[PDB]
């Protein structure tokens, strides 16, 4: 009956139709929650290969022809792999090894972007920053960032209060250990009535050996104290024990008295 046939125009694929998920590890890894990452058409036999590579994401069939997208649902990064660095946002797991770069057959695992803006790393770094695993850079930056914690949410503060109590108990035993000296210094730079209160509390709890060794500017001898009464200026302005003292182990009173020494414009000592 001679039908009037007509062929459709030749197809012109879009950028989405040319997407190859096997080339998109640097596109999918920085994705955040609630964000769809289109990965182009995906054969049915390759869905398990994609879902195992990105267990944190949900594979969603968005359109015809197998058009798919990945939607981040979780962050599975662990504390030892996310907390001891401020630059690594993700890593790849393959054959029991952890790598920074992608490799075929590896499994993506990502860190929370706010892992160092909250207290999600306080427990791991409280232990890791003690003893032989102490990294001075990472641990000082961890304690310092706690004082300016972006999570002003009342739970971000409560984690801050919990860390200060743990550091207070720890540093009362020995304030010479490097993470405690870092804590004392950041309390000094915070310059509040609470932080100064905690400084004096920690320093007064130290042993007689600690005070004999580090705090002789705070606890002068009998003859040193009697001698200082003959001078109008505070003792801390001329006492060699105060010019040789570790500023992190000074009582708040001695630290304030050091800034009252009347410098003659230039070098006044």
């Amino acid at each position, epitope marked *: 009956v001679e039908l009037p046939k007509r062929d459709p125009p030749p197809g012109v694929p879009t950028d989405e139709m040319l997407l190859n998920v096997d080339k998109m590890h640097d596109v999918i890894a920085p994705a955040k929650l609630l964000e769809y990452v289109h990965i182009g058409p995906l054969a049915k036999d390759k869905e398990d290969k994609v879902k195992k590579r990105y267990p944190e994401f949900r594979l969603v069939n968005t359109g015809p022809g197998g058009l798919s997208a990945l939607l981040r649902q979780s962050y599975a990064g662990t504390a030892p792999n996310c907390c001891r660095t401020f630059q690594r946002t993700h890593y790849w797991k393959k054959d029991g090894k952890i790598s920074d770069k992608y490799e075929e057959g590896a499994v993506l695992e990502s860190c929370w972007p706010d892992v160092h803006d909250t207290g999600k790393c306080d427990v791991d770094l409280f232990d890791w920053c003690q003893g032989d695993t102490f990294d001075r850079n990472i641990c000082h930056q961890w304690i310092g960032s706690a004082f300016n914690r972006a999570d002003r949410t009342v739970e971000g503060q409560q984690s801050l209060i919990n860390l200060y109590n743990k550091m207070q108990t720890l540093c009362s035993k020995d304030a010479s250990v490097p993470i405690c000296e870092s804590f004392l210094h950041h309390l000094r730079a915070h310059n509040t009535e609470d932080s100064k209160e905690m400084i*004096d509390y920690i320093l*007064r709890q130290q042993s007689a050996d600690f*005070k004999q060794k580090y705090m002789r500017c*705070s*606890y*002068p001898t*009998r003859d040193k*104290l*009697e001698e*200082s*009464l*003959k001078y*109008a*200026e*505070p*003792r*801390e302005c001329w006492d060699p024990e105060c010019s040789n003292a570790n500023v992190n182990f000074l*009582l708040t*009173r001695n630290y*304030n*008295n050091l800034g*009252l020494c009347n410098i003659v414009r230039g070098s006044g000592l």
Partner: nanobody
Amino acid sequence: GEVQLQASGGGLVQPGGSLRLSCAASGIVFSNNRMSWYRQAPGKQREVVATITSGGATDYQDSVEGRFTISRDMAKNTVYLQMNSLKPEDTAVYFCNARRDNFATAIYWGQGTQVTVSS
């Protein structure tokens, strides 16, 4: 004559109590003298316990640091010694002391008050 540094506020308290010593100075101005609180146990030499400069910077003996606090009122020209957590070894006669800033001979010693701690 007439440089008065009378110390008061003493008493007998149990260990752990509290006392606020007082010393209202006359003939001497605090904004020009260093005030020091001394004590002398029976049959012992006197020792400085606290001190405050003419600028207000304080300093203490180690055995009383954190427990005692020396303050001053410029209007009232009176220097205080807040004594907290009194230990039995605090038992002594506490008295005032005034020393001129750059005049070494202008030192004066006050009349003491009794502080006893026991049960």
